[PDB]
Copies of this chain bind each other. A is one copy, B any other.
């Protein structure tokens, strides 16, 4: 088992995909992450199952953070997008709660690209609005681990997947009478 497969397999991390480590091997992708997560190299090795080095517990955390931040970049590359598109087709991220979006499958998104500013939310292509995950096992995931441009990039590479707009809409009525507004 890889550190990564283990992570992505944990409960609450259903929204993540396994980042190809080739991507991680290209130092050019990790630009500026070093000046962002504590124990950078120590955490980077841990993610790569490389040599460790006394509560080396706080490391796993920075490994999460690091992994998380890398993920946000990865899913902008075609492979990442492909892996995510697959989880999309599997409904891994849930479906739009809005009644008239008829369970349109959602995509994970971040309200900010800066860490620790907001927990990952859910985007609906149909709606084009963002919602809060119904599960709580997802109320501790940083939106920054997904970013703000991911959902868009995906659809701006796979347009055939964009949904047809809602054939129906909510129409308020008191007794069969359309109330306005």
A residues with a Cβ closer than 8 A to B are 97-100, 111, 113, 121, 128-132, 134, 148-149, 152-153, 170, 172-176, 179, 181
Contacts and interface: CB of A to CB of B under 8 A. Distances in A.
A23 to B, nearest CB: 19
B179 A152 contact: yes
A134 B96 CA distance: 11
A111 B99 CA distance: 10
Residue with the highest number of chain B CB atoms closer than 10 Å, among A121, A170, A176: A170
A95 to B, nearest CB: 9
A174 B155 CA distance: 12
B170 A130 contact: yes
A22 to B, nearest CB: 24
Shortest beta-carbon contacts, A-B, top 6: A149-B174, A134-B134, A97-B97, A97-B131, A99-B130, A130-B170
A130 B168 CA distance: 12
Given A153-B174, A174-B148, A175-B149, A99 B121 contact: yes
Contacts of A175: 113, 148-149
A131 B99 contact: yes
A98 B174 contact: no
B174 A129 contact: no
Given A97-B97, A99-B121, A148 B131 contact: no
Contacts of A111: 99
B99 A172 contact: no
Contact of A132 (B99, B132, B153, B179): B99
A81 to B, nearest CB: 14
Contacts of A129: 98-100, 170
A152 B172 contact: yes
